[PDB]
Amino acid sequence: MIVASILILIVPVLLSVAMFTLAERTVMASMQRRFGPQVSGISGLLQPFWDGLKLGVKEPVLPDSSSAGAFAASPMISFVLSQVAWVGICISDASFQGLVIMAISSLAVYGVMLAGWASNSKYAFLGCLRSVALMVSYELSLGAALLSIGLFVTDGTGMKCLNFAEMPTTPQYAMLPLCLIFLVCILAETKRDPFDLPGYNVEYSSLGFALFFIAEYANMAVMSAIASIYFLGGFSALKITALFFAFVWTRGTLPRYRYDQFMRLGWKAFLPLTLAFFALHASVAI
Amino acid sequence: MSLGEAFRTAVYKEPVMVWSLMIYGVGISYAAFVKPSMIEPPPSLKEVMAGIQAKLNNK
Amino acid sequence: MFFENSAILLCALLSIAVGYTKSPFMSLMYSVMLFINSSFVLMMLGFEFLALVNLLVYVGALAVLFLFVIMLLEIPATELRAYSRGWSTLGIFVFIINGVFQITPSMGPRGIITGLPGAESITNLGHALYLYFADLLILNSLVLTVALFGRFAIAPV
Amino acid sequence: GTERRPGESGAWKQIERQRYASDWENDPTFKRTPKNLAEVLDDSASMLLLTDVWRGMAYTLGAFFDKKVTIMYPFEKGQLSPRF
Amino acid sequence: SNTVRVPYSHELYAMSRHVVFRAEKEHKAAVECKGKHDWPEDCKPESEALVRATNKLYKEIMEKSPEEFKEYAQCLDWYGLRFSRCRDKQTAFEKAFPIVDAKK
Amino acid sequence: YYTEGEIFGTTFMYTTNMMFWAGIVGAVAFRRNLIILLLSAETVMLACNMNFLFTAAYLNDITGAIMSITITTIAACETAIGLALCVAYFHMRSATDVEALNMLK
Amino acid sequence: GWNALPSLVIITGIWTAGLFALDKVQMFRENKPAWANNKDGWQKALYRRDWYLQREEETLAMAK
Amino acid sequence: GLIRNIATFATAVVGWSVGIPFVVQARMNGYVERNLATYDAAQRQKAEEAAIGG
Amino acid sequence: AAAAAMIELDLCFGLLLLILFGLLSLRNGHVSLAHIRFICQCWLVMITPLEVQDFALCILTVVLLQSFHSFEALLFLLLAYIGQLYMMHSCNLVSFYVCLEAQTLCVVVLCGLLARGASTSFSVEAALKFLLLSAMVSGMALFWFSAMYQRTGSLDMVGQETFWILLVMLFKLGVAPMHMWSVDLYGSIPKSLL
Amino acid sequence: YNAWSPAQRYFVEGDHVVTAEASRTFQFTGLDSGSFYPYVIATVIATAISTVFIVAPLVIAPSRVDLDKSSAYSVSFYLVSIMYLLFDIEIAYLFPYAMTHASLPMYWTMNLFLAILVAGFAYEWGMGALEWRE
Amino acid sequence: TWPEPPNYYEAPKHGFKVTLENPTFPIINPDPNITDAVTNMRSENWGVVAGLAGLGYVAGYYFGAKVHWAKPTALFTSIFLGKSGLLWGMSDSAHRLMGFKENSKEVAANLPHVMQ
Amino acid sequence: RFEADEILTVRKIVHPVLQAEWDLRYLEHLKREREEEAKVMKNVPGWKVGESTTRHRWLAPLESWDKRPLV
Amino acid sequence: TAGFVWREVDPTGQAKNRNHTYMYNLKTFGHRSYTRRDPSELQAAATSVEARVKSGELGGLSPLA
């Protein structure tokens, strides 16, 4: 029954990832006064499936100067971690569920760094360290935000936890600036605009590349569900769609930062703000 | 310069640091001074349960 | 209980494997596998939070520093006498005597112990850390301060 | 607006120059220091809480609900002249 | 050996208000015995009295108001022994079977 | 003669003893670099941490968990300082040593 | 625009149907709509006692 | 090669998972045997001390 | 009641104020820090109890601070003094381990920091060797403490496992034949740390 | 895992309980509360799926051998990695505080902990170590 | 076997350093706050606070004048030594109030209705 | 806080009933074990059935139903 | 404290040297002790419980049939 529940979870995750990448193309097109994919299937509804099948019959490039095992292992590790994080969202009852998902998302750094070590490109090694530095820098603000969230999460028996079923079903109006910081931290983790300067998958083709992008979009959906649980009073389909629309909307209208600019932002703005909010919420919670 | 000029120049040249220190100070000050002035203030199992039922039955 | 005992016994294999291989990258990969497997072993004992701390600190933070240092400092010299010099037979004899036969075990005269799962309470841990062992908590903070200042002073300029 | 700030300067020599000297106060294209409480709150609501990102977001959301300029080739064509 | 047991956890939670209002003396004796003596042999009569006094009360409720007790205990079972999700069933059961003997 | 819990406990203790001696000896025995020596020191710390957590569960006692947190803190601080010193020494001596981080050659 | 509406509707429908199916499957596995709640040591003790006493009631039923 | 290394790792893991429990079982059997010898020697000493101690 | 612990709160408050004062002094470009050293010596006197051995250590460290000149070195010596003072009051292996490890980390970092000239790499080399040799002795201490804790169920330092703890203590004093880390340290590290 | 003693089975005798436990369905409301067992199965299943994704284009795709197709087309990270290590340890320390209903002396002890943290952080800020110009 | 039902909302009343004494003098207040500690402090405590502050000012002026920064060094050193003395004096007053030190002066001043 | 206080009160009511039920079951299991031991060791010279090991304090079983491994 | 100790001399001399671990644990955690019940009370209580069972104001040992 656990294997059945996990496969029944896995099916809409992949279907949703295909529909997310189509919806990103089409919403980005509608903001730019065009159409986006319409030809490939009726209303363009077959475009992600033909992208996946095109990459399926695409030639796998295995460079004969790299280490083949780590090269194969990097997108597998990314994909596996995304699927495991989704299972932790929906098929768990653990006491420290948010800490579990934070631990899983801290493991997601390895696919980037294994891709940087494996492929023998000069600037893949240069960009992997930058991407890892960005993700590493914003993980701390995510953790301090979780500290602020957990100060008010108590179940019926009186025990404090990070269990998702014990979270309240009303929006957390008291933590609006922390919610905004959380959303920009999600944007920084997924390497989206305005942090998309670093790429690391420059040597990958066919289904290894497809695994990289499925992992990226599934991680975006994980973080969207986490933000909707923590701040928006629950996990729902409408909230997932609205937050995804917001992320595409921000990608349509903004330019990106330099490397040192978002490093200064994450180490001089977001971390002191989350720590100061934690101290204020701890003072309130007494 | 006085408090006002130095504060305005500091918050104009670096607002996030000043606002972070203000949030931290508000929390520390509320727990130190504001909380202990306004908000701060063997029966058997049968009396405790009777009180719980009395609190439940009116609402 | 075959898979649980096998998962327990896998940690010693990975501990040997860290030093056995000639590739520094593969040594770090073995260490990451070992720390993930040990975090799952600690959760057989009933510890949920401390296993997550194991994962988050060692795999999430420290192994990234290891991989950056290795990838920045290791031009391939596995042929350059890392294979051509072999290993030490005296050290292998010491390992066999002390860790396989275990002539000086930690249980001493006892040879059998009943493993018992716990029930971790984080309220008890919070009470202990912030009331009963508070001086040790502050001295741990001072050690972390030593680490931060000392690294930033020792950073190569 | 096209105004400048000490801190929003993209380089390092000007960042070092604005935090160690008040030569930027002579330049007329810079935004002046706030003088009272309400001006400080306006400056903080500019820096924190964004509101400059939001104007661009409102424009792009208006464009999301606007008309499109795409033609459906080869069922629809462009426009040419007899001199083509 | 004889089979000794008390009702299930949702039934125990559903009947826990009547235990202190109708079997208080057995509860007091069991608490005092466990405070004084650690060996389970030394507190056998009071343990047996408390078990039998709980089971007699469970037999009383099923004779007087079985359907209200069954729906309330099923509600407590469904929602993980959270009392705040079954206030209406609790009110109906306490109306059918009072905690203390009323109008006496 | 013995139960499944006794097999589980004795297997845990045998595993951690072999882990401790593997971390103490093996990287030195195989003539590895200072980076791998620091990794093996982390293996030693992991063996001690697992022993403390096993004992804390075994006695129903809090002191093993306190020791676990402390061990993680001290081990990470020492490892970070050692890696910084390794990088500094490598940049100071690579012009004449090539194999500078290997002192067991 | 009108071209972006079908994909955005389909994402919502996919997640609605998938969450409904996963809910029905896990409800069949657990038989109570509070299986995902936080449980402390007392609640774990209560569930384990309930399971073992249910097994005992099954064992005693197949003897009469 | 990659297939050779994956096969060698799988072989080492399976061989370790089958061979070490025999080492542990032999060690526990030796401890049980020595403990039973200690129990019998203690009983012998107790009988001797009861015999000449009244 | 925490009224019996004002010296600990004073220690922490003094460290918090001293870091901020050292930061403010360095923002002025002061190339000497005798005022910081005097405040460090005052802090050393203010946290030391009224025993003979405690004050012997205190007066010794006040005299030693006159040979150190940077802010970071003074901070490392103060945080090594905290371990040196509180090890004399340690009645367990928990506090024993933490005090010894704080002292080892401070010594390693100071050996890295203060070297100059052609002897820089020799000092860093000897500091690395000392750190590696110290790590395994710390592991031995932790391992046999875990053994003692499992056997006795308490924090008493009795039984056969105290022999290995004694060997840990003999390592920290440079007792032969575990003496060669100190012999390596004497040949390269500067005279003030010696 | 199955219970190996009569005390672990709440003193229920018989052979029906042993077989019923060994062949039980996984249940968070039975014997497997807070279990973390679905995390392992998810890893196994997802590793199977990604391996099938890796292997399949070696069968159903064209391939041509070429020597050019198989060819290639700072200290700030040390700062970030070591600072992230120390700050992650500090957040892990702060997590048992937030999971308790803390009294006032616990609050002031935690604030002393945070004060030491932010004092070291503010020293590194003031010396210009968080300005990533190099 | 069956554990005690945990009380999540009640924390133990425990200070990390335990005195291991019984008081040998009359107990006025077993748990005085900071206002209680300052309002029953003796004059010798204020004298040693002012002496420490003055010595700190003079020595800070001497050491801060070598880098031409004498006045802020004097102010900081004065505050540093003065807070050390103030913590000492408050602790002494609280120990007299709790009964661990001689409090004949304090018993005849802190109990206006329980004077004699 | 009100919900937690109610649940704590109910748990305090139920705890002696459960401990009593545990005690009676433990006694019955001990009786069965003593019958089995008396059947096994009847011919052994000097063996005593039912010899408690400790002298003053009762010893609970090491293992219990409520503590199980997670994975 | 839990890992540190401080020793000071009693000015009056009216303090007795004991084990500070035992004193610390007595103040911090306490010490629980029990006694064996007198057997006559056990048979008296067993007789009273048997009489309460026979007279009908006590139930059975199981809720089942």
Ligand SMILES: CCCCCCCCCCCCCCCCCC(=O)O[C@@H](COC(=O)CCCCCCCCCCCCCCC)COP(=O)(O)OC[C@H](O)CO
């Ligand atoms: C620029 C610096 C100036 C410093 C001096 C001025 C600032 C004032 C000093 C700070 C406050 C006074 C000192 C502490 C007062 C404790 C006395 C007390 O009882 O106060 C409260 C005690 O609570 C606290 O605030 C306790 C503080 C705990 C501090 C814990 C950490 C101690 C230090 C550990 C360091 C470890 C050692 C490191 C080296 C190994 C509660 O009062 P009450 O009992 O009357 O109220 C009862 C109420 O219900 C709450 O209890």
Ligand SMILES: CCCCCCCCCCCCCCCCCC(=O)OC[C@H](COP(=O)(O)O)OC(=O)CCCCCCCCCCCCCCCCC
């Ligand atoms: C940077 C800015 C940070 C902002 C920080 C905001 C802090 C907000 C604190 C809000 C406190 C909770 C809201 C009111 C609930 C009180 C509960 C209560 O008394 O229950 C009894 C009672 C309920 O009756 P019952 O049925 O008897 O329980 O409620 C009241 O009496 C509440 C009456 C309203 C009082 C409103 C007070 C507004 C000002 C509070 C302080 C604001 C300044 C603090 C900082 C100053 C500078 C340091």
Ligand SMILES: COC1=C(OC)C(=O)C(C/C=C(\C)CC/C=C(\C)CC/C=C(\C)CC/C=C(\C)CCC=C(C)C)=C(C)C1=O
């Ligand atoms: C501007 O942003 C974008 C990109 O740049 C970042 C892109 O690169 C792409 C293109 C890349 C894509 C679409 C690859 C990632 C997605 C995949 C592979 C789809 C996953 C879908 C699955 C597994 C379900 C399909 C399989 C089915 C139905 C099974 C069929 C079986 C049978 C018929 C038997 C897009 C669309 C995009 O917008």
